[PDB]
Amino acid sequence: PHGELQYLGQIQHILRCGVRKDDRTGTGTLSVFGMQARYSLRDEFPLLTTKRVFWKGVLEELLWFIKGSTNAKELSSKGVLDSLGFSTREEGDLGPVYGFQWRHFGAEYRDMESDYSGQGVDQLQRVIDTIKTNPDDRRIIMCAWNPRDLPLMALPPCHALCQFYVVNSELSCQLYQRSGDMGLGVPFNIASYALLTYMIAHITGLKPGDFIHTLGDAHIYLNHIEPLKIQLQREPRPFPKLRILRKVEKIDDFKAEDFQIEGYNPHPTIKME
Numbered sequence: 001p002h003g004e005l006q007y008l009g010q011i012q013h014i015l016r017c018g019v020r021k022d023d024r025t026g027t028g029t030l031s032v033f034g035m036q037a038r039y040s041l042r043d044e045f046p047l048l049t050t051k052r053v054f055w056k057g058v059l060e061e062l063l064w065f066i067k068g069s070t071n072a073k074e075l076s077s078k079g080v081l082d083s084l085g086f087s088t089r090e091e092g093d094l095g096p097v098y099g100f101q102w103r104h105f106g107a108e109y110r111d112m113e114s115d116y117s118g119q120g121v122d123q124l125q126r127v128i129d130t131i132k133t134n135p136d137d138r139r140i141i142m143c144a145w146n147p148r149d150l151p152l153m154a155l156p157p158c159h160a161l162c163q164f165y166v167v168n169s170e171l172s173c174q175l176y177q178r179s180g181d182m183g184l185g186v187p188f189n190i191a192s193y194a195l196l197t198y199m200i201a202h203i204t205g206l207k208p209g210d211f212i213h214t215l216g217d218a219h220i221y222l223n224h225i226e227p228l229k230i231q232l233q234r235e236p237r238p239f240p241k242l243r244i245l246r247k248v249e250k251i252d253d254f255k256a257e258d259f260q261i262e263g264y265n266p267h268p269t270i271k272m273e
């Protein structure tokens with residue numbers, strides 16, 4: 001039985017048992033606390049089939065993140081409350097934000113054109129190195145922050161924690177998100193971290209295993225209920241495959257054309273606010 005049925009069952013559960021709760025901007029959601037789903041990565045790829053998921057932008061944004069870019073324009077050229085500073089956000093400089101954290105966590109930030117080699121902890125290279133040096137390690141963990149939180153406090157809570165896990169030649173990944181937007185973010189995140197798992201697995205000589213997605217505040221924005229009610233009447237189709245087209249060595253060497261989705265036949269796009 002389909003992994004996508006988990007996602008559908010969770011939409012249904014929120015629209016049946018979710019309670020009203022407002023987000024940051026006093027905007028309204030249906031919310032349930034604590035959920036999880038598992039998607040096999042073995043000989044398939046969890047790109048949701050009940051609406052067409054924007055795969056090329058999942059890929060391109062992950063590449064931007066892997067590059068550690070803080071330049072909005074290095075992504076914008078793919079067509080895909082955070083504020084401080086006049087000349088710099090005209091520029092497109094986002095500050096020490098997003099992928100900066102995966103590749104240079106904790107480095108004093110200069111500008112977006114600066115050279116940061118060997119500055120701060122490279123969480124991502126560290127995960128890859130640990131998988132190679134000690135596959136049993138229970139600490140293969142990479143965190144991400146909402147940029148808005150960084151200036152806001154000391155020891156600010158992560159938005160996402162990712163933990164990899166190896167047994168019997170299989171690479172699994174668990175993504176824990178302190179909140180998840182079920183209509184828009186969640187399918188995008190499932191594909192994004194399954195893609196990352198496929199990349200790490202490839203450069204470390206392992207086979208992808210499971211992607212496990214865990215949420216704290218799983219929620220549906222009031223304005224997505226109706227389109228989601230309609231998405232629920234669609235029957236999932238077999239997940240596609242992801243194929244890597246070249247042999248790749250190092251996680252920074254990956255390019256968009258290294259990747260090819262196969263047998264992807266989704267139901268039409270659903271637009272949600």
Ligand SMILES: O=c1c(O)cccc2cc(O)c(O)c(O)c12
Binds near residue numbers: 154155158
């Ligand atoms: O300071 C931290 C920080 O500002 C961000 C949030 C979580 C962290 C987690 C750590 O394990 C670590 O060694 C840290 O320095 C932090």
